[PDB]
């Protein structure tokens, strides 16, 4: 450990075009393994990792019906949200769920998640105590009151401590050949002429897993995270990730700049120059 299981569920209303779009994807750490797509030829819960193709048909059947139930939940919640905020019925809107659990060195629950969002903003979320809710606006206070009265926090907590955590261990055993790996980043600094006065130093990080990494430029101990360009971490497409950070430095002073890479696969953080 530690490890994490996450589902990212999206519904997008399409008035005048048909029923809402609905898609759910499941991730173990930074590895996707399942999906449900309402716009596919045959909408059904299906594997997206090779180590999931050995599950019986009753796994996919039960997961599909749960996904079909949630799709109806999103259709209702989208209409209710439209009403809560007194919005026009002709606009497209988004509702998102994000739920899962974190397990650790000994493979038991660190933290459970039940997060909900409307049009890309926090709506309501289950607190870490797995008992109380945090509502983002007064419309979500209505939701929170209703879910508090019904005791849905106990329903979610039972899932987080039971199904979420026990199935995460099962996934971690099915894909133990690939999921438990730790690929250290291969890092180096490149040189790119820019002007007659300065030059670009680009620090690369390649082929690392998991995706979490820190790239930092410093000038003689002092730090440069204000002045640098830092792209988002991106997937290579083969199961590893990439990232780079660049800085504009004056000609002749490249050796005064150092790039630092922090990663779970790095025993000691790397410090690089050109």
């Amino acid at each position: 450990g530690p490890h994490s299981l996450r589902y990212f569920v999206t519904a997008v209303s399409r008035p005048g075009l048909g029923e809402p779009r609905f898609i759910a994807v499941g991730y173990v750490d930074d590895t996707q393994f399942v999906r449900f797509d309402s716009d596919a030829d045959n909408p059904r819960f299906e594997p997206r990792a090779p180590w999931m193709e050995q599950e019986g048909p009753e796994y996919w059947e039960e997961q599909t019906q749960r996904a079909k139930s949630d799709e109806q939940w999103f259709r209702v919640s989208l209409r209710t949200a439209q009403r809560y905020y007194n919005q026009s019925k002709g606009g497209s809107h988004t509702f998102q769920r994000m739920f899962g659990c974190d397990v650790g060195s000994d493979w038991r629950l660190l933290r459970g998640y039940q997060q909900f969002a409307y049009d890309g903003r926090d709506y309501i979320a289950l607190n870490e105590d797995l008992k109380t809710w945090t509502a983002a606006d007064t419309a979500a206070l209505i939701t929170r009151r209703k879910w508090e009265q019904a005791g849905d926090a106990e329903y979610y907590r039972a899932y987080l401590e039971g199904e979420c955590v026990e199935w995460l261990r099962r996934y971690l055993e099915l894909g133990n050949e690939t999921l438990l790996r730790t690929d250290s980043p291969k890092a180096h600094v490149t040189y790119h002429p820019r002007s007659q006065v300065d030059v670009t130093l680009r620090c690369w990080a390649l082929g690392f897993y998991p995706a979490d990494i820190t790239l930092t430029w410093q000038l003689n101990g002092e730090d440069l995270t204000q002045d640098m360009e830092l792209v988002e971490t991106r997937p290579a497409g083969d199961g590893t990730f990439q990232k780079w950070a660049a800085v504009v430095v004056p000609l002749g002073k490249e050796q005064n700049y150092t790039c630092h890479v922090h990663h779970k696969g790095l025993p000691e953080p790397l410090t690089l120059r050109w």
Binding site: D70, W73, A150
Partner: peptide, 9 residues
């Protein structure tokens, strides 16, 4: 394992 949301907003 997918988690059911028991009640809508």
């Amino acid at each position: 394992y997918y988690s059911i949301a028991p009640h809508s907003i």
